[PDB]
Amino acid sequence: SMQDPIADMLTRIRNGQAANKAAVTMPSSKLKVAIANVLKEEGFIEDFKVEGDTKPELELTLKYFQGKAVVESIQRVSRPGLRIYKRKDELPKVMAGLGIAVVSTSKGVMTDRAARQAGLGGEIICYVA
Template sequence: MANHDPISDMLTRIRNASEKKHQNTKIPASRMSHSIAKVLQKEGFIADISEEGEGITKHLVLELKYSGKHRHPIIRSMQRVSRPGLRIYKKTRGLPKILGGLGVAIVSTSKGVMSDRDARKQGVGGEVLCYVY
């Protein structure tokens, strides 16, 4: 069965890789997955993003981050919020604060994909893609 939700596929790949303490994980490249990865990197959840392959076989390689000598994953939870069957949109004021601001909601706005913090700063709302903490 073909996956109709590339974003939840991406989140699952990152979640699985960090649970198994992999150094990095590969996800199929797309503009949306690249934007989400950029937000995760800016917010300090992943260390690095690189591209691999050409055309249809292009992949993003995300380098995951861990803390301490026991390598606890920085990403403790990733939840898909808006999905193809049920889109969730929020206005600027309605944007959720994840764990009192410790986590981040990734929002797709008219000004691009950004964290809930940046969306509030720019005064834009949009589709709440996922929560990460």
């Protein structure tokens, strides 16, 4: 059964980029939208939008630069079978700072850089580069 919707979102992006899809759609959730917001603000995806009400669908517009997909890697870190939490000092650097780690903190989902500047740890959702 479906036991990790976030890993599914990341995979839809990974597989979408590898297949040169313009957009990818999926069942929405508040956490998926929170992650989509971070990906947009850091410039990994172009745009997102939620459509529906009873069964909302999240669409992500993927971005390509010089033919190549911009999301070169995207990996689930914390997962249902093994949750991963880090203190502020132990927050991971992705690609020596050139990538992002998405972190769920008590002040919402944000990048590792924003968590570190806010002085927060949290759950490491995924690495993006």
